[PDB]
Design a protein around this ligand. Structure first.
Ligand SMILES: [Cu+2]
Ligand SMILES: [Cu+2]
Ligand SMILES: [Cu+2]
Ligand SMILES: [Cu+]
Ligand SMILES: [Cu+]
Ligand SMILES: [Cu+]
Lengths: 336, 337, 336
């Protein structure tokens, strides 16, 4: 497309919402290619990541860890206005794994506090893709400070199975998984700091052990439980988008399955089926499609169970509906 | 199916066998859907996991690590009687990754010492699947104490490749891989404990390092070697089912390949072919089909070679038959330059 | 084939080239099956792997870490003369993952210093495959001392996509990734040793932590960056072969993609498409095909970004050509 052709395309301004929720969108594209406009303000802020009051100096796209999910369709243009307020201390940028050129956009979006930038890229490939900050010489530090999210580039005709049959979800959730490395004292108590830079040297030491102190969904242990448990009903079709910008994960829906899983996150790669546990490498997003068949509480985990149940990588689903005794029944309840 | 219809189905009681062997089963389903009945008694037991005499307080389905492989066909029902004897100290349950609902059955099978339960589920999806204990608040401790195994849900028409051609194995082995996290004293020597509970706090510390002290097949370093080495012959078709309930593995047959590998373990997902090293994520089972072409000793390993040869993740095959010089030959044996 | 038929096959000697470059070959097979002959001398030598003068006693096929890429076609034979000079102090051998029998050849190629051996095997399966030394009882020590490489067994009709359309590369690079486990003294300084064996006990202790001190491409931090960056042009089709003989990796082309990725490395397994980050398990090789669309500097990394940017697993591509504003443009450059 020429500069003139792009200029003539319709514009749509999207309002982003906080994960695990996803902004309003259509699965099948409405009309032809558009320039889809997003704005995110970067917030450097303290976050509390466990019930012991452990703190991380988060570097958060749109004020959240993970950053929000941006949804476009194949061959749309994604136009991001990225803002780094004067209240921040560090330079930031953005690398879209979905984008082609200039280190995913990182080379064109380096903004100091008090600066903003506008990047436009063509979403040529359908799938879920990681995005993250990557300042030269400071890359993993920003990423493991929570400065990452994902986008979804839907096929223009929506999702399909390996045989070309349409797959249409009722609900979509975005689970961003984060590896944290909290510094040791000598007593084994987590250290607190009053500036992000003050934590750098100590954090780098922990990072280099390749052993996270916490592995969490949505920025904290138990984040996606209770008041933030995800919800569904029996018969409901749900897409779970899962990202990890720095480290491998292995999602599993306890009590369920991944009926269709784009484990690589790319929609032109046929999905795996009937999955118990899928695998998403560090630096990637994946997506799982499931139709709920049983009511009750589900746990959604990274199935290294130490990571899930000692380090924090566990979410819940609360599912309504009728129990199916054909699928599962207690013939004899626990008894003497 | 209605309650009346399920009640009308044939019942078949199966006697389980110890890994790496698999009970008789057829491969192609014989007749219509059935309710296949299994019984397992849970044993909390001391096991020795290396030649030094390192002990683990194992929590063992059917008294073995891994628990035994249960084999059914798609749309059969698996009906498990699970028994927690009064001689045990902990509550246990079971999560079948193959099952749908109540945390894989875990929510319906919480049994205290002196209790039993019977769970029935419909095996709706074909493949190999992990099962493991998962008591709320104590999940990884039970799993990494060896309380896990796998099942196989065969398609009713047996196995096929990605293109609809039948794949019929001559024999099957189940390799359960276990990460252990054994506490050490100040001398760096593995600690021994009187009671399972005495080891909890020390073990959780090691678990949090995400670095196992031992990574083993069939419950111990060298368990599948010597007179316990797996066996095959040139021309023999072998299915190797491999599970890891907690941690990633990367199986490799040294001297061989995986001709067809269901790396995700699910038979409706077409298998990868001609594999050197496959990958099974923690919390899953996979399966590899191979026809042996050369005689001699093979090593079957987790191909992080530190895990294989330092931490214990190596098994052997003994293979009978005629050497094939077309496939491989020593043109010049090691000799002076 | 009969005994006379095998003996009647042409023999061809090939001159090897140091990684990341690859020796002369044709993508489509030229003529019928051949016995392709290679020679490699094993070198035990001290190498410097980082900017701080850190030493490894390398055990190097053909004197390089990784060993060179050998290229044949399906149903060719690979016939390797392996030489262990009397100046070396250890026994070595070779396990070809591409080969069938005798522990990949390891059982037939155990050569003491002052010995040589010739192994022939039929390359029955198409793909990229690891090779490595594997002396019984000291296997990981040799491998993590850099004694590993890869081969490529091309289909006789060259590469194809999942739909059977031909994929012809303009150039090929081989990136061997190495995990090193370098002992440190109590002050955190890396230790030096007189002879390879002197480091054995200390090195195994580090190995058992499963935490490399260094993760590098082409044998050293920054070996494929700066003036040693790999090169391409806009419109050029590049195959990147990547191997890791001992430990998982997750390759990512920053600013690009893997258009077609044989993540398992086997060409009869259909390639994944539109990949952001692919996954190669320890003990395997993979291959990614990409057509460059934007000029400039790219980074090519293991996308555990701590491994990439703290431990050394980062390479560069320098790409020439015209910038494509349709694919990506800075609408507003960083500004107040
Ligand atoms: Cu990235
Ligand atoms: Cu589980
Ligand atoms: Cu190997
Ligand atoms: Cu940043
Ligand atoms: Cu248990
Ligand atoms: Cu060697």
């Amino acid at each position: 497309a020429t500069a003139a052709e792009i200029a003539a395309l319709p514009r749509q301004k999207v309002e982003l919402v906080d994960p695990p929720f996803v902004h309003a969108h259509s699965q099948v594209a409405e009309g032809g290619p558009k320039v889809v406009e997003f704005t995110m303000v970067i917030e450097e802020k303290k976050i509390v990541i466990d019930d012991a009051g452990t703190e991380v100096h988060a570097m958060a796209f749109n004020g959240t860890v993970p950053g929000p999910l941006m949804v476009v369709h194949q061959d749309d243009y994604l136009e991001l206005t990225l803002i780094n307020p004067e209240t921040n201390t560090l330079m930031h940028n953005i690398d879209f794994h979905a984008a082609t050129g200039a280190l995913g956009g990182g080379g064109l979006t380096e903004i100091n506090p008090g600066e903003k930038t506008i990047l436009r890229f063509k979403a040529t490939k359908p799938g879920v893709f990681v995005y993250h900050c990557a300042p030269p010489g400071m890359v993993p530090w920003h990423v493991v400070s929570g400065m990452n999210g994902a986008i979804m580039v839907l096929p223009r005709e929506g999702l399909h199975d390996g045989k070309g049959k349409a797959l249409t979800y009722d609900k979509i959730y975005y689970v961003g998984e984060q590896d944290f490395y909290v510094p040791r004292d000598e007593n084994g108590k987590y250290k607190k700091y009053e500036a992000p830079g003050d934590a750098y040297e100590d954090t780098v030491k922990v990072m280099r052990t390749l052993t996270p102190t916490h592995v969490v969904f949505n920025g904290a242990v138990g984040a996606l439980t209770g008041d933030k448990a995800m919800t569904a009903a029996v018969g409901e079709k749900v897409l779970i988008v899962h990202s990890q910008a720095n480290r491998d994960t292995r999602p599993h829906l306890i009590g369920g399955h991944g009926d269709y899983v784009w484990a690589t996150g790319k929609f032109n790669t046929p999905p795996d089926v009937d999955q118990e546990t899928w695998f998403i490498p560090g630096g990637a997003a994946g997506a799982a499609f499931y139709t709920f068949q049983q009511p009750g509480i589900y746990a959604y985990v990274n199935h290294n169970l130490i990571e899930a149940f000692e380090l924090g990588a566990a979410a819940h689903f609360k599912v309504t509906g009728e129990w199916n005794d054909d699928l599962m029944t207690s013939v004899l309840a626990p008894s003497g």
